[PDB]
């Protein structure tokens, strides 16, 4: 029974964990996408060339 | 019987483990894919050339 409850904590906490990492990955990637959409191709072009 | 219960903990925890690593691999690869879709081929082109 302790193994069972342990499976409950495991599945729940793992799901919340993956959801957190996913949502943070979302805000991060959306942030970087906002950056490249903002400063534009030519700015990173300036940094590169 | 202890070996049997041990097989239960083993299969369950291993399944949850592989599921976790898989979902995290999903958020990671989706993150990187979001990056390359965002900054674009020409940005990594700028970093490379």
From Swiss-Prot, chains A, B:
The record's note on its domains: MVP 3 mediates interaction with PTEN. MVP 4 mediates interaction with PARP4.
Membrane-spanning ranges: none
Full protein: residues contained: 764 to 812 of 861
Annotated source species: Rattus norvegicus
Cited function: Required for normal vault structure. Vaults are multi-subunit structures that may act as scaffolds for proteins involved in signal transduction. Vaults may also play a role in nucleo-cytoplasmic transport. Down-regulates IFNG-mediated STAT1 signaling and subsequent activation of JAK. Down-regulates SRC activity and signaling through MAP kinases.
Subunit structure comment from the entry: The vault ribonucleoprotein particle is a huge (400 A x 670 A) cage structure of 12.9 MDa. It consists of a dimer of half-vaults, with each half-vault comprising 39 identical major vault protein (MVP) chains, PARP4 and one or more vault RNAs (vRNAs). Interacts with TEP1. Interacts with PTEN and activated MAPK1. The phosphorylated protein interacts with the SH2 domains of PTPN11 and SRC. Interacts with APEX1. May interact with ZNF540.
PTM description: Phosphorylated on Tyr residues after EGF stimulation. Dephosphorylated by PTPN11.
Protein's recorded name: Major vault protein
UniProt gene name: Mvp
Subcellular location: Cytoplasm; Nucleus
């Amino acid at each position: 029974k302790v193994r069972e409850m342990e499976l409950i904590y495991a599945r729940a906490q793992l799901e919340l964990e993956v959801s957190k990492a996913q949502q943070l990955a979302n805000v991060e990637a959306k942030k970087f996408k906002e950056m490249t959409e903002a400063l534009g191709p030519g700015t990173i072009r300036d940094l590169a060339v």
